[PDB]
């Protein structure tokens, strides 16, 4: 009966909040002060949380799921009843964890040695990522691109084939058709009177939104190709694809390292307020106190006053071994801490606004039950953090926060320099993200057999992304598995939808703050009505369907690409005038070796 499930969850909601607390408090003491008497302090305290949750999970199947009427207590029950693994045979369950540990340690400890000196050998993160991000030598970028895929990616090919079979068995025992349908279960919504969403409906909404970005991406692809021919003459065709090893990093995920070759007006400095911070003696604490004044300006609460003692805003005065990585912690019981090692720079002035945005999202849904204290889907949590960073990087906000000469002149040449640096990171990553999840979805359902994995991968690079390989690759390579998110078992569609939600939030908040100009000049400071539009979504958590959360801000029930294109229309107008003598589009027949 349904009233027994309510009494089940309230014993759960008070044993979990304490056991999650000290399992996360011990993870704080390891992260900010590393010993090994802290790693053993967090492994036993971490396993008491994991052993407790599988005990309550096997108690949750005593209650049926379709004999429930209240939507909230049904949502908590389905998130706890989830079997996930453990549906496999107990010798297949240990084979899967052996593969996931072997693929993870090949990626982090794989070395590449030089053919002129076999005694010097580079790892990926120090040394191989620096070549792909800084070099202008064609022959050295071609060496680092091919040798990472032929010496490390060939080890992951027999391991990734066994990984697909075991993950499809686990997904079909949980009544999905494949493992790709298991990943799309985040966006599913069942029976809330007009707000429903199918797991197959996500596939059409991604492909419908993508064919409206292809006019903008084609003009960006044509402008970068014309600028790369001056940097690498006799290597690039003026009507063809771009070679895969000249894109700024190892995989071509972000084009953000191509800015020094593709800058529109290099005689205008892109605005940088780092010298005005060290001329006014701003400490470590000023960067957060101006960040807290931004959020109280819009109508959001202060920091919790436990935030100021418990947090560790710099690396300590001790030479203290403590993972230095910006992050926002939500230990529980209303205890919010930020861990970062901040330097006096406009870079960490902006990520301070980003990391505080995770805190203000966390402080808002802290009145829901324990199992609904996440973002409404996997994409909302990063998207609310980046609309705080866009509004703080504007020169309108910088001159009113005291950091820009009240006699500063923004010209139309510097807005093109700023918008093109945004499009190399935002627009340049959208066909990469769409192509990769489309390839992984077709591998799991079996539309691509294993004798055509690397054949269909490079046909989709030339057609969707416009990127050609420099050396042909047969079915002994596995080039997707040489990325971190593929070999470490992570979903990748959250980076596509976060980019679309980010400009839907920003365009909906700037109509409430009564903006008049272009969308990229907007700032939501001093408003109250925009914050009330934002706070009505922030407090929902997972208690409502995410389509119901979007109408509280945007006014629509689906993700939309038209606010993303309105941000880049000053660039799209300027790009169509720079490509009057160029060719827009590419040919899938040209190759850098096929002459």
């Amino acid at each position: 009966i349904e009233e027994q499930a309510k009494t089940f969850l309230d014993k759960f909601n008070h044993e979990a909040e304490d056991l999650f607390y000290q399992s996360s408090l011990a993870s704080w003491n390891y992260n900010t002060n590393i010993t090994e008497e802290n790693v053993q302090n967090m492994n036993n305290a971490g396993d008491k949380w994991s052993a407790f949750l599988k005990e309550q999970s096997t108690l949750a199947q005593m209650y049926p799921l379709q004999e429930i009427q209240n939507l909230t207590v049904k949502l908590q029950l389905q998130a706890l009843q989830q079997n996930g693994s453990s549906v496999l045979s107990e010798d297949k369950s240990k084979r899967l964890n052996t593969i996931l540990n072997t693929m993870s340690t090949i990626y982090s400890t794989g070395k590449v040695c030089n053919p002129d000196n076999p005694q010097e050998c580079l790892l990926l993160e120090p040394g191989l990522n620096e070549i792909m991000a800084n070099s202008l030598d064609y022959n050295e970028r071609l060496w680092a691109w091919e040798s990472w895929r032929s010496e490390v990616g060939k080890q992951l090919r027999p391991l990734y084939e066994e990984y697909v079979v075991l993950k499809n068995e686990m997904a079909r025992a949980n009544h999905y058709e494949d493992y790709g349908d298991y990943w799309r279960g985040d966006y599913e919504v069942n029976g809330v009177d007009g707000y429903d969403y199918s797991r197959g409906q996500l596939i059409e909404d991604v492909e419908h939104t993508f064919e409206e970005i292809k006019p903008l991406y084609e003009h960006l692809h044509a402008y970068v190709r014309a600028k790369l021919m001056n940097a690498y003459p006799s290597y690039i065709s003026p009507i063809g694809c771009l070679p895969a090893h000249l894109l700024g990093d190892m995989w071509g995920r972000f084009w953000t390292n191509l800015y020094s070759l593709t800058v529109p007006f290099g005689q205008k400095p892109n605005i940088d307020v780092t010298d005005a911070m060290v001329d006014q003696a701003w400490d470590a604490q000023r960067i957060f106190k101006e960040a807290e004044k931004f959020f109280v300006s819009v109508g959001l609460p202060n920091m919790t006053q436990g935030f100021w003692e418990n947090s560790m805003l710099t690396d300590p005065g001790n030479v203290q071994k403590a993972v230095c990585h910006p992050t926002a912690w939500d230990l529980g019981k209303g205890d919010f801490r930020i861990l970062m090692c901040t330097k006096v720079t406009m870079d960490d002035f902006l990520t301070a606004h980003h990391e505080m945005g995770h805190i203000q999202y966390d402080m808002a849904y802290a009145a829901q039950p324990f199992l609904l204290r996440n973002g409404a889907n996997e994409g909302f949590h990063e998207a609310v953090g980046e609309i705080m960073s866009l509004s703080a990087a504007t020169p309108k906000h910088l001159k009113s926060i005291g950091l820009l000469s009240p006699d500063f002149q923004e010209d139309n040449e510097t807005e093109i320099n700023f918008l093109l640096k945004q499009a190399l990171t935002i627009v340049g990553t959208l066909p990469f993200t769409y192509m990769l999840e489309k390839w992984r979805w077709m591998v799991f359902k079996g539309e691509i057999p294993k004798d055509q994995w690397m054949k269909k991968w490079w046909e989709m690079k030339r057609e969707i992304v416009g990127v050609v390989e420099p050396v042909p690759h047969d079915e002994t390579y596995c080039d997707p598995a040489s990325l971190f998110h593929v070999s470490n078992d992570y979903s990748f569609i959250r980076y596509y939808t976060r980019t679309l939600y980010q400009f839907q939030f920003q365009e909906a908040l700037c109509q409430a703050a009564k903006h008049e100009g272009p969308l990229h000049k907007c700032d939501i400071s001093n408003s109250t009505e925009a914050g009330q539009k934002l706070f009505n979504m922030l407090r929902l958590g997972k208690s409502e369907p995410w389509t119901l959360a979007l109408e509280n801000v945007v006014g629509a029930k689906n993700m939309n690409v038209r606010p993303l294109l309105n941000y880049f229309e000053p660039l799209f107008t300027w790009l169509k005038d720079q490509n009057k003598n160029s060719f827009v589009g590419w040919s899938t027949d040209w190759s850098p070796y096929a002459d």
Partner: protein, 98 residues
């Protein structure tokens, strides 16, 4: 490490009458199945403990409460405020209260 000595009751058959008190420790029975003094599904111990810890956000830290309740049965009198004493004088026509 958590002060686990401060408990509260989280299951009862029926809400309390005003100023009523209940220190029993019988195993609660949520479902219809009888409990027979042992724990299990739908048979819960009725007391939980605040695990208080010094690094808790406000609203999670312990507050001490005192409830004063003045009652007036039908006696002849009892405790009350304190009476003040105004300075004294004399030899002058005055308005007095003794």
């Amino acid at each position: 490490g958590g002060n686990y000595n401060y408990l509260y009751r989280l299951f009862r058959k029926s809400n309390l009458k005003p100023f009523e008190r209940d220190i029993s420790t019988e195993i609660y029975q949520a479902g219809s199945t009888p409990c027979n003094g042992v724990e299990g599904f739908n048979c819960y111990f009725p007391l939980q403990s605040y695990g208080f810890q010094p690094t808790n956000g406000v609203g999670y830290q312990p507050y001490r409460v005192v409830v004063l309740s003045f009652e007036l049965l039908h006696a002849p009198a009892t405790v009350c405020g304190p009476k003040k004493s105004t300075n004294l004088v004399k030899n002058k026509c005055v308005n007095f209260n003794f």
